[PDB]
Amino acid sequence: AITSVDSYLLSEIKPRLNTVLENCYIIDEVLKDFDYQTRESFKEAFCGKNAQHEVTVGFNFPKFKNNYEAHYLIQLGQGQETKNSLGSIQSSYFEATGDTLVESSTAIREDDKLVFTVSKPIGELIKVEDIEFAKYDNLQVEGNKVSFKYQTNEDYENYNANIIFTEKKNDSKGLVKGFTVEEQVTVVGLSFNVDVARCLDAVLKMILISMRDSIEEQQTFQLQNLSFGDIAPIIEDGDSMIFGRPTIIKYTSSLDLDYTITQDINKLTFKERKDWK
Amino acid sequence: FINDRGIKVLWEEAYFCPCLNPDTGHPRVDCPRCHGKGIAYLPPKETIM
Ligand SMILES: [Zn+2]
Structure with a gap:
């Protein structure tokens, strides 16, 4: 697909940041190496459900004033294409496949089959969690349902699973044409308190490590690489300075389009014609 | 003094639009x-x- 690393990072960082900040012992583990008073002050101010201060995330160049006490500024950077395929053919498909998804589901009995229902039509099934079927189990997929023979499996009549699968758009042939790009995004934790900037740096590094395992950047946005700048005053001529430490996140990812092929051939036919010269 | 020296203008007040x-x-x-x-x-x- 076409991709937007900045919007991915914003969408991914915001919930993760919230879920760490609402959970005190996580911060208590992340900041174990800092000075005791720095740790306790940060945990008192920003952390837990009762926290009176709050962190914020957003892109650069807003028209309004931000929460300069603690704010992650996201800032789309450079990139370059790095590796190309022969013919620019990144892949080919017989059935137009969408995004990868993971969904929780439960088995149910139906007509002496077990079935799992999924919210969308299954274009491909990658894994039913914790199950490997035998041929006897007569595994079949149909529409948005996975179906599974009941006879030997009655104990599992309410078994709970996670389905990893991917959508289908439509039944069509084509070529995925495109290339790989290596692209940079900068993130900086602004604070007018230097110890807050240092803690926001630690929290961001933890978040990015945790992010490396996510499906989003396992399937796309691969090879996350981190670089770190000096701590410096971002703005120097207010009633106080504003500090931050930049980090650069670099990703390798595919830019591509679905070139559908309308041509289809369904029968050869043969004829002999005679040359009398 | 100001009413004598100034030009007539229409003033309209800014606020951030809630469409952001x-x-x-x-x-x-x-x-x-x-x-x-x-x-x-x-x-x-x-x-x-
Ligand atoms: Zn508006």
Whole structure:
């Protein structure tokens, strides 16, 4: 697909940041190496459900004033294409496949089959969690349902699973044409308190490590690489300075389009014609 | 003195438009209340400046 690393990072960082900040012992583990008073002050101010201060995330160049006490500024950077395929053919498909998804589901009995229902039509099934079927189990997929023979499996009549699968758009042939790009995004934790900037740096590094395992950047946005700048005053001529430490996140990812092929051939036919010269 | 020396103007007051994207923080370019500027304006007021 076409991709937007900045919007991915914003969408991914915001919930993760919230879920760490609402959970005190996580911060208590992340900041174990800092000075005791720095740790306790940060945990008192920003952390837990009762926290009176709050962190914020957003892109650069807003028209309004931000929460300069603690704010992650996201800032789309450079990139370059790095590796190309022969013919620019990144892949080919017989059935137009969408995004990868993971969904929780439960088995149910139906007509002496077990079935799992999924919210969308299954274009491909990658894994039913914790199950490997035998041929006897007569595994079949149909529409948005996975179906599974009941006879030997009655104990599992309410078994709970996670389905990893991917959508289908439509039944069509084509070529995925495109290339790989290596692209940079900068993130900086602004604070007018230097110890807050240092803690926001630690929290961001933890978040990015945790992010490396996510499906989003396992399937796309691969090879996350981190670089770190000096701590410096971002703005120097207010009633106080504003500090931050930049980090650069670099990703390798595919830019591509679905070139559908309308041509289809369904029968050869043969004829002999005679040359009398 | 000001009423003698100033020209008549229409003054209208700025405020941020509530169409700003809750994630990206940027204005919606199709917003009718503000034509892609992030700033909406209250009804005009006659003044001299
Ligand atoms: Zn507007």
